RNA sequence: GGGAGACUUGAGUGCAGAAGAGGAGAGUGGAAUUCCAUGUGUAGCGGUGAAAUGCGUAGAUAUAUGGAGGAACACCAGUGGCGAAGGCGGCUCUCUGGUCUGUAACUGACGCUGAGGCUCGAAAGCGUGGGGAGCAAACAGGAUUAGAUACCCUGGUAGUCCACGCCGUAAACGAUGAGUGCUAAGUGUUGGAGGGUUUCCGCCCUUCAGUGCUGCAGCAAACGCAUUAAGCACUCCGCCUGGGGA
């Protein structure tokens, strides 16, 4: 659940966090841990390509099995663990043959659940099936766009998608964004919705916490200089003072669509949203 | 629940007299028997009788109506109530309608009328007025 | 006369379309008990049975 | 459940056939209260059933008060057996 | 225990072998979830009072079962019947 | 009144039965509206007292077939049922409260009321997060009018729906606190119980608990109430003391 801190200090005032009750252990699997360096939004050229990133707490990557392609044996859910790299929690599961792995934690997952993958798997939380075998109306997550590539859609905390129907070699899916689109029927997905549904309600509370979470301060364009931002310059506070608000590189900010107009996927996108 | 069985008995008699019923029946008790016998000997009620059952007994009262079916009992009033007990000293014994009625009183000499109570020069608890 | 009591049946199967038909009109509407001669208890039981039959497709909802 | 009720009655009967008594009634009501507490914790919005729960609690309190007024030793023994306060 | 009647409609196009396998599978589910199937029988192939999932005919099959109320046999049957394609519709009702 | 006893009518338990939109949880079914898509098809559709706004040749309205989604549950349906009240109406299952009728095995007054407290409490409203078909404050336009910040018409946001948590107010009304006992009848209806017939159905009598109407005694200022008292009585609680100010 969400625990709200008493206003002992102005920094602590109005702050809330997660009690991490669902978390069972704080010992990550050494075998599945991999090193990660903080790129701080800088590419191989060393240029800052994405602003407002850098600093923060060191993290280790937990290899998540988004593919869920080990259909032979079931996996016993051993622990629900905190993952610094993603909003949702992860789950350490042991395969009966002795292979240990991580998966995204679906809502309602419990330690001891015996999860299965493959066309014959039952329609239960945590199981993985090809979309063709998932009955209409089912709630799913961890949907893979290309067969064998591994789940890509619906992976953030609390997200979910709904199966709406079949057509040809495609399955109709409503994604968390509300966009309705076709996805190749041979693609797999996990039954249920991503756990940690409460993540959105957390009130960060202070700047230092964002810094911990690796967000550097964001500067409004209206307070920069003319050569720095289109909104920069002017005496005192000023309005946008342009036909439309624009990004630092002149791209309009409000309402201007950026999706490629000749994108191939348009053929598969049935109804858009956002 | 019933809290004043004496007042209940008085009200039963009052209603039966009002509709001019010939008889009435009540759950029995020592105080009720005393009141019934007092009325019997004072001529307010034609007759009294008792039936033995397995709860508390029953007391049956045969009312008295004069020529032209005129009601002998004009009314009854409960004086001492559970909410407020009423006690009178010997001098304070009340006269009902200048004696045309009666006041049933419980005293250390037993349950008696106001006439008897003031003749003996003792007070008590004024159970009821009858007239 | 209450047909249910007359036939002396205390159980009303929702499958007995034969029985349920005499208690609905054309258009499939349920008849008032004042019209069908039946009592309140049997009327309620018939209502439940007919609704279940409608749900299971044994009786039509309309027409 | 009737079987559970009967077994409790047999356990707490003051004597053969003692269906009604402070001990028997209080024990049965305590078991009912526990079960209904579980039910309420499952369905916190079941105010209508919670009212019946409160009525049971009140009746059990009245019976306990009567038992204490009557025989304090039996009252103490009963509360010790049933784990009450 | 409590007695339930489960009546469900099998899509008319089902093959005989498929129907037999389906009936056995669902009765097995009921048995495995701690419920005693006192009977299961194909009732009738009938016309529906209205179209259901594009069909106007259906095979009504009746399963009389008993179980403790707490037992999940009824819930599991409901879940799997809803998921399944062969069963157009189903209804479970307490009986005497 | 206190103490020591006994008793079963009050009260409760036991045993055998009855009905119910009682409550909560999770599902599910059809009608219909709206929208989306595709045919057919041509000039209106819509609406008023009359109009206009509006929608429509970018092909509407209509009509046919589908799809999505929200909300409420036609017929049954009834001063019918249930709940302390608010209120509860599609169907299914899980949990669950209460009520009533028998019997008389059990306890043996264990009961009533109940300030202060605690709980629930229509609609609107508030917070977080969802949902959002129809309706609809605000708002916009068109009419009306002297004016029309309205009635009327065309749209339409919050809200109306869900989960959680606040709010705790209503002509929250039977404008009638609860408990108990007594006092003509007549006639409906709901759930039982018993008996006398009746081949069963059913018909008659009795009786219990609700719900209605009519109507004695009595009460009332009158209106009217009248075994569901506003009559006759007792216990406890709440509340009133001219109108305004308030
Ligand atoms: K702060
Ligand atoms: K995290
Ligand atoms: K900023
Ligand atoms: K500036
Ligand atoms: K199905
Ligand atoms: K019940
Ligand atoms: K709201
Ligand atoms: K009646
Ligand atoms: K004054
Ligand atoms: Mg940024
Ligand atoms: Mg500057
Ligand atoms: Mg510039
Ligand atoms: Mg500028
Ligand atoms: Mg300036
Ligand atoms: Mg509301
Ligand atoms: Mg309007
Ligand atoms: Mg008020
Ligand atoms: Mg009556």
Q: What is the 3-state secondary structure (H, E, C) of chain E?
A: CEEEEEEEEECCCCCHHHHHHHHHHHHHHHHHCCCEEEEEEEEEEEEEEEEECCEEEEEEEEEEEEECCCCCHHHHHHHHHHHCCCEEEEEEEEEC
Q: What CA–CA distance (Å, rounded) separates A195 from A105?
A: 5
Distance CA A228, CA A226 (A): 5
CA distance from start to end of chain C:
27
CA distance D7 to D2: 9
Any strand F atom closer than 7 Å to D51 CB = yes
Cβ atoms of B64 and B70 within 8 Å: the answer is no
Q: What is the 3-state secondary structure (H, E, C) of B17-85?
A: HHCCCCEEEEECCHHHHHHHHHHHHHCCEEEEEEECCCCCCEEEEEECECHHHCECCCCEEECCCCCCC
B56 contacts: CB under 8 Å, gap ≥ 6:
B27, B28, B29
Among all protein residues, pick the one whose CA is nearest to the C1' atom of F12: D20
Q: Which helix (H) or strand (E) holds B129?
A: strand B124-130
Token digits for E41?
């029988």
- Residues 1-60 of C, Cβ under 7 A from nucleic strand F: 1-2, 5-6, 8, 24, 28-34, 39-41, 43-48, 51-52, 54-55
Give the residue nearest to nucleotide F76 (CA to C1').
C30
The answer to whether the C-beta of D9 is closer than 7 A to strand F is yes
Determine which helix (DSSP H) or strand (DSSP E) holds B125, and give its type and residue range.
Answer: strand B124-130
| Ion ligand 3, residue ranges at CB < 5 A | A 218, 220
SS3 state at D44 = coil
**Using N-to-C axis directions, what is the helix angle for D22-42 and D72-82, rounded to 10°?**
30
Tell me the CA–centroid distance for residue D53 and ligand 15, in Å.
Answer: 27
User: What does A161-203 look like in DSSP terms, one character per residue?
Assistant: EEEEEEETTEEEEE-TTS-EEEEETT-EEEES-BS-GGGGG--
Q: Measure the CA dihedral C43/C48/C52/C55, to 10°.
A: 90
Query: From CA E7, how far away is CA A195, in angstroms rounded?
Result: 37
Contact D29, D59 (CB under 8 A): yes
- Technique used: cryo-EM
Q: Identify nearest nucleotide to residue E50 by CA to C1′ distance.
A: F30
* A90 close to A26: Cβ distance less than 8 angstroms: no
Taking residue A177's Cβ as centre, other Cβ atoms within 10 Å add up to 14
Nucleotide nearest to D25 (CA to C1'): F13
* Chain centroid offset of residue A198 CA: 14
Chains B and E lie in contact, requiring 3 or more CB pairs less than 8 Å apart: no
Protein-proximal nucleotides of chain F (any atom < 7 Å from a CB)? 7-16, 19-25, 27-31, 67-69, 74-78, 80, 83-86, 90-98, 105-112, 119-121, 128-131, 164-165, 179-184, 189-192, 200-203, 217-218, 231-236
Residue E65's Cβ-count burial label (10 Å; 0-12, 13-18, 19+) is buried
Place of tokens 């007299």: B17
Q: Give the closest residue to E58 by CA, choosing from E68, E48, E49, E66.
A: E48
C-alpha angle A130/A132/A133, rounded to 5°?
75
Closest chain C residue to the Cα of E58, Cα to Cα: C57
From chain E residues 24-83, the ones with a CB under 8 A of any chain C CB are: 43, 46, 48-50, 52, 58, 60
Residues of chain E contacting C60 with CB distance shorter than 8 Å: 49-50
Q: E strands, chain A, where?
A: 2-4, 16-18, 33-35, 60-62, 75-81, 90-95, 100-104, 114-115, 128-130, 139-141, 161-167, 170-174, 180-184, 188-191, 269-271
Backbone torsion region of residue D83, taken as left when φ is above 0, otherwise alpha when ψ lies between -120 and 50, otherwise beta: left
Reading phi first (left if > 0) and then psi (alpha if -120 to 50, else beta), residue A187 is in beta
Q: Tell me phi and psi for residue A254, to 5 degrees.
A: -110, 115
**E54 closest CA partner among E78, E32, E85:** E85
What's the angle, vertex CA B117, arms to CA B112 and CA B121, rounded to 5? 155
Cross-chain residue pair C56–E9, CB shorter than 8 Å: yes
| Amino acid D49 CA to nucleotide F22 C1' distance, rounded Å | 9
3-class secondary structure, C2:
coil
Mutual angle of helices D22-42 and D2-12, in 10-degree steps: 140
**∠ CA(D25), CA(D27), CA(D28), 5° rounding?**
65
Which 3 state secondary structure label does DSSP give A81?
strand
Angle of helix E73-83 versus helix E16-32 axis, rounded to 10: 150
Helix axes D72-82, D47-70, angle to 10 degrees: 140
HSE-CB of A66 using CA atoms within 13 angstroms? 20
Three-state DSSP state, A157: coil
Place of tokens 């109709």: A172
Q: Nearest Cβ partner of C60 from E46, E50, E58?
A: E50
3-state secondary structure of B108: coil
Structure tokens at E86: 């062969």
Give CA–CA dist A165/B53, Å, rounded: 81
CA distance A89 to B63: 91
Q: Rounded to an integer, what distance in angstroms lies between the CA atom of residue C38 and that of residue A31?
A: 76
Place of tokens 């307490």: E94
- Judging contact as 3 or more Cβ pairs under 8 Å, the answer for C and E is yes
Q: Rounded to an integer, what distance in angstroms lies between the CA atom of residue E41 and that of residue E60?
A: 9
If one counts every other C-beta atom within 10 angstroms of the C-beta of residue A125, the result is: 17
Q: B30-42 and B5-18 are packed helices; what angle lies between their axes, rounded to 10 degrees? A: 40
Residues 6+ positions from A45 with CB-CB distance below 8 Å = none
A52 is in an annotated binding site: yes
The CA distance from A32 to A68, in Å, is 15
C17: closest chain E residue by CA:
E49
Q: How far apart are CA B7 and CA B29, in angstroms?
A: 13
C and B touch per CB criterion (3+ pairs under 8 A): no
Which two tokens mark D11?
């356990």
Q: What's the token pair of residue A147?
A: 């067969």
Resolution, expressed in angstroms to one decimal = 3.1
Enclosing H/E stretch for B126: strand B124-130
Number of C/E CB contacts below 8 angstroms equals 28
Instruction: Judge whether residue D62 contacts strand F, using its CB and a 7 Å cut-off.
Output: yes
Angle made by CA atoms E52, A138, E13, in degrees to the nearest 5: 30
Closest CA–CA distance from residue C2 to any residue of chain E (Å): 23
- Check CB contact under 8 Å for E43 and C11: no
Which residues, in sequence order, are CB contacts of B32 under 8 Å at separation 6+?
A: B5, B6, B9, B26, B59
Residue E8 main-chain phi, psi, to 5 deg: -140, 150
Q: Rounded distance, CA A213 to CA A53, Å?
A: 9
- Between the two ends of chain D, the Cα-to-Cα distance in Å is 26
User: C46 φ, ψ to 5°?
Assistant: -65, -40
Burial class (CB in 10 A: 0-12, 13-18, 19+), A215: middle
Sign of the CA dihedral running A108, A110, A113, A119: positive
Torsional sign, CA C44, C47, C52, C53: positive
Question: What is the CA D62 to C1' F177 distance in angstroms?
Answer: 24
The closest alpha carbon to A134, from A113, A163, A107, A109, belongs to A163
B112, containing H or E segment: strand B110-113
């Amino acid at each position: 659940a969400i625990k709200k801190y008493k206003p002992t200090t102005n920094g602590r005032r109005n702050m809330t966090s997660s009690d991490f009750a669902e978390i069972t252990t704080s010992t990550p699997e050494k075998s599945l841990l991999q090193p990660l360096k903080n790129n701080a939004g800088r590419n191989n050229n060393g240029r800052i390509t994405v602003r407002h990133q850098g600093g923060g707490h060191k993290r280790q990557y937990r290899v998540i099995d988004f593919k869920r392609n080990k259909d032979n044996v079931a996996a016993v859910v051993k622990t629900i663990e905190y993952d610094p790299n993603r909003s949702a929690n992860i789950a350490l599961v042991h395969y009966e043959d002795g292979v240990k792995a991580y998966i995204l934690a679906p809502k309602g997952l419990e330690v001891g659940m015996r999860l299965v993958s493959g066309p014959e798997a039952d329609i239960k939380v945590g199981n993985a099936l090809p979309l063709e075998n998932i009955p209409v109306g089912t709630v799913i997550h961890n949907i893979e766009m290309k067969p064998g590539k591994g789940g890509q859609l619906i992976r953030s905390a609390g997200t979910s998608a709904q199966v709406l129907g079949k057509e040809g070699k495609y399955v109709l899916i409503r994604l968390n964004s509300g966009e309705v689109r076709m996805i190749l029927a041979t693609c797999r997905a996990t039954i249920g919705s991503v756990g940690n549904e409460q993540h959105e309600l957390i009130n960060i509370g202070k700047a230092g916490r964002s810094r911990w979470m690796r967000k550097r301060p964001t500067v409004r364009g209206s307070v920069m200089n003319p050569n720095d931002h289109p909104h920069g310059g002017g005496e005192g506070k000023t309005p946008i003072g342009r036909k439309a608000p624009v990004s630092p590189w002149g791209q309009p900010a409000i309402g201007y669509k950026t999706r490629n107009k000749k994108a191939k996927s348009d053929k598969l996108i049935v109804r858009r949203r956002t | 629940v019933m809290t004043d069985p004496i007042a209940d008995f008085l009200t039963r008699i009052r209603n039966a007299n009002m509709v001019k019923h010939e008889t009435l029946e009540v759950p029995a008790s020592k105080i009720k028997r005393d009141i019934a016998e007092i009325l019997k000997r004072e001529g307010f009620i034609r007759d009294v009788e008792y039936i033995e059952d397995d709860k508390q007994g029953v007391i049956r009262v045969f009312l008295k109506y004069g020529k032209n079916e005129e009601r002998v009992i004009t009314n009854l009033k409960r004086i001492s109530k559970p909410g407020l007990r009423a006690y009178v000293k010997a001098d304070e014994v009340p006269k009902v309608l200048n004696g045309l009625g009666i006041a049933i009183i419980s005293t250390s000499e037993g349950v008696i009328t106001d006439k008897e109570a003031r003749a003996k020069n003792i007070g008590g608890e004024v159970i009821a007025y009858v007239w | 006369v209450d047909y249910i009591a007359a036939n002396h049946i205390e159980y009303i199967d929702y499958k007995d379309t034969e029985l349920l038909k005499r208690f609905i009109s054309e258009r499939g509407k349920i008849l008032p008990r004042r019209v069908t001669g039946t009592g309140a208890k049997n009327q309620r039981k018939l209502t439940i049975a007919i609704k279940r039959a409608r749900i299971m497709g044994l009786l039509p909802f309309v027409s | 459940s009737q079987e559970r009720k009967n077994e409790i009655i047999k356990e707490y009967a003051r004597h053969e056939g003692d269906t009604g008594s402070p001990e028997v009634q209080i024990a049965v009501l305590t078991e009912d209260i526990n079960q209904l507490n579980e039910h309420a914790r499952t369905h916190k919005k079941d105010h209508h059933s919670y009212r019946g729960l409160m009525k049971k609690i009140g009746h059990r309190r009245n019976l306990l008060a009567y038992l204490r007024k009557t025989d304090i030793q039996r009252y103490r023994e009963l509360i010790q057996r049933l784990g009450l306060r | 225990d409590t007695k339930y009647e489960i009546m469900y409609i099998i899509r008319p196009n089902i093959d005989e072998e498929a129907k037999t396998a389906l009936v056995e599978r669902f009765d097995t589910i009921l048995k495995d979830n701690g419920a005693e199937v006192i009977e299961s029988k194909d009732w009738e192939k009938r016309r529906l009072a209205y179209e259901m999932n594009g069909f106007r005919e259906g095979i009504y099959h009746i399963v009389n079962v008993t179980s403790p109320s707490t037992a999940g046999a009824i819930n599991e049957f409901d879940r799997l019947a809803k998921i399944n394609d062969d069963i157009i519709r189903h209804m479970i009702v307490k009986v005497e």
